[PDB]
Homo-oligomer: A and B are copies of this chain.
Amino acid sequence: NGYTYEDYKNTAEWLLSHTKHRPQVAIICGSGLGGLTDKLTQAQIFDYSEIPNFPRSTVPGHAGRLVFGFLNGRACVMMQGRFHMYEGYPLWKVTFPVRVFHLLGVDTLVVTNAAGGLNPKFEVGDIMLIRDHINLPGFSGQNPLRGPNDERFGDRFPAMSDAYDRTMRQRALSTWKQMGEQRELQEGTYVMVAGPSFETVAECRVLQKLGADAVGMSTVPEVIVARHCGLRVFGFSLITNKVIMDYESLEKANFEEVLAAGKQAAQKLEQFVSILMASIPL
């Protein structure tokens, strides 16, 4: 890890002295979900590039910002554009923001992402509440906590079996019902793979045999660091496509499929996340 405790501290103190805002809930916007930032009030924007120690977004669009504000009753800080392992960033950079949030006083992390549906029940547009995850990169050594542990952040061996807050998942299922929606709220296991290339049929079948319901290339690292910090964690995936699981299919996954899904059924998540804020204690 190239960061020392001081680095996280310095970045937090810089932010704290450049904004009157004091966030309680940190929200990471997945692909095509950045619009969520438009629902904040008294919003204050910070480009990642201007924040000390922040990984500088190479060239995925040069759009990487931290937005502080209020979202339906809660002091929030949103990440519009997140870092991925496939871009070349080691995991201690990918998750650097999470530890900054903790030092800012955030006690809750809401993570969202786009994902390929592995579970056949799922349909494009569906929203999957994340009940658990399979950290494939983690089994091999790509775990954000690798390296000496800093007691100031947490324990050497944190548990992850209870990573996704049970209470929030219940209130999430409730809220979705209280809203009376067409499709039911899906729930399941998210498996992380490094990417950036999409899965083959044989790989899709592997992921399915392991019991995964959705596949993506992010999230798990941030969740692990959040939990290590003691933050409450809740999240979901927007199923943007059904992964090809048989050789008969003549279609293939693409960047267009994802953002298009994250174009129409996108707003649904935005509302959901906004309303869900009221369900977050304080």
Contacts and interface: CB of A to CB of B under 8 A. Distances in A.
Interface of A: 1, 58-60, 85-88, 131-143, 145-149, 155-163, 189, 193-206, 209-212, 224, 227-228, 244, 247, 249, 252-255
5 contacts: A137-B139, A143-B196, A155-B255, A158-B197, A160-B198
Given A59-B148, A87-B148, A141-B142, A160 B211 contact: no
B161 A199 contact: yes
6 tightest A-B contacts by CB? Answer: A140-B140, A88-B147, A159-B252, A141-B194, A132-B202, A136-B139
Given A87-B147, A140-B142, A161-B198, 20 more contacts: A86-B143, A86-B145, A88-B146, A131-B247, A132-B201, A132-B202, A132-B247, A137-B141, A139-B193, A140-B194, A146-B194, A157-B254, A158-B196, A158-B197, A160-B203, A161-B199, A161-B204, A161-B249, A202-B210, A202-B212
Secondary structure call for the A interface: loop
A227 B138 CA distance: 26
Copies of this chain assembled into the complex: 3
A21 B255 CA distance: 37
A138 B198 contact: no
Given A136-B139, A140-B136, A146-B88, A158 B198 contact: yes
Contact of A200 (B59, B163, B255): B163
Contacts of A205: 211
B254 A194 contact: no
